[model samples]
Target: VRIPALERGPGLKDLAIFSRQLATMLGAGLTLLQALAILERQTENRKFREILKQVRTDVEGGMAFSEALSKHKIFSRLYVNLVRAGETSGGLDLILDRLASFLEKELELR
Candidate 1:
């Protein structure tokens, strides 16, 4: 019953769910590429789907997660910085969980 053609930019709600699901999948041992591909297909937001497709290609091309995300304006500096730190410390799952909670809180406040 949903249509992607009418979908516009991904809103905070999309980001919130994306973060939470991504965190859970990452924590469950899915590779970044796998997670990205799955999420790309799963997202109803066309814009978000396009963004994830680009990010997946970048990661598959060997770019760091944070670096790829930084290429997109939608990703905040704080988010990119936190992801970079997580990549460095080998705790991306933990950081993703934090981001999910953070996004959830922001969504609630809005």
Candidate 2:
């Protein structure tokens, strides 16, 4: 039997807001856990908030941010891999900015 697929939720508006918030938090001297915690508290969506909380837990548990995110399977492999590379290269913050820009451009194109 075929399972019904979940409908797509919010679009670029939500993503753009999230990306900007995350990037800004990272840029402003917040540690990854701190940023994630803030985002989890600030997020209005239950589902997204839960995801953020999970990510925070994973990060706090010593998992790399990108690794934790990749485990969720919601993010694209390309995105995950890029972030992993960034983490490995010690330039995750810069990568986050680039990722934000990529998302924004993708949203615009769509």
Candidate 3:
């Protein structure tokens, strides 16, 4: 049986915006958990908010942000792994900026 395509609703749009906004915030020197909390509150997507809440919980419990993202299989493996590398290298904010650029270009390409 074919898996159904994931719905691209208001939630997904909010997620996209959140990704871009979070990258901007990180670039502006916000800590990962701080960015997550701000995005969680600002996001229009309930699902994304839930995900951020869980991620924040994981981070609070000493899990790496990338590892927390890996637990959510909906995200691409590339993104999760790249975040892992960024976290390891103390360049997470830069990586987030790059990821935001990639997403923006990808959207334009579509």
What's every prediction's RMSD, in angstroms?
4.2, 2.7, 3.4
Report how far residue 89 has shifted in candidate 1, in Å.
Answer: 1.0
Residue-wise lDDT of candidate 3 within 6-76, one digit each (tens)? Answer: 64334334545766887888889888888888887887765666777888899989998888988775567
**Can you list the residue pairs that collide in candidate 2?**
none
lDDT of 3 at 95: 82
lDDT of 1 by residue, 12-98 (tens): 998989899899999999977788888988888789888989998999999999999999877899999999999899898999999
Q: Residue by residue across 11-101, what tens digits does model 2's lDDT show?
A: 5655566667878888887877788888888876656666777888989989888888886645679878987897788776787788788
lDDT of 2: 0.75
Which ranges of candidate 1 are over 4 A from the true structure? 1-7
User: lDDT of model 3 at residue 78?
Assistant: 89
The per-model lDDT (C-alpha) reads 0.90, 0.75, 0.77
TM-score quality measure for candidate 2: 0.80
Query: How many backbone clashes can be found in candidate 1?
Result: 0
